[PDB]
Amino acid sequence: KVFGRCELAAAMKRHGLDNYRGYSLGNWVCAAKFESNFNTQATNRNTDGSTDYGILQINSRWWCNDGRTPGSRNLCNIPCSALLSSDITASVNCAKKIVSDGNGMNAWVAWRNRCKGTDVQAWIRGCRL
């Protein structure tokens, strides 16, 4: 599924992401825009044997198990295929774990390069919520 911006913002808000560990909702929507272009089926197969999965492009080395990646930690305790759902729950739950395991939003390269320092509120302006 390819989300709309406001539809994704509402879903993320329902799942508790606004102000999770001090990151406002627009940070999460921005990260998803630049990671996956809002596409829940996005996959990026890397040359290191890992793959980035889903709307938030969560990597298979540390976070989910795909059975093909060397050094797998599976810290979210899920198959990576759960991250390719039209429902965002598993991706949200694992993203909360990523920030709870000591990392901030810098874990997402696209957030650091394309969201940090910008008016992230623009991503939820006019919506819903």
48 is in an annotated binding site: no
The neighbour count for residue 7, using CB atoms within 10 Å, is: 13
- 7 catalytically annotated: no
Closest CA to 83 of 21, 17, 36: 36
| Active-site residue, from 52, 66, 87, 119 | 52
- 18 catalytically annotated: no
Contact 29, 9 (CB under 8 A): yes
C-alpha to C-alpha distance for 66 and 117, rounded to whole angstroms: 34
| Active-site residue, from 35, 48, 66, 119 | 35
Catalytically annotated residues: 35, 52
- Numbered residues of the known binding site: 101
Annotated binding site for substrate: 101
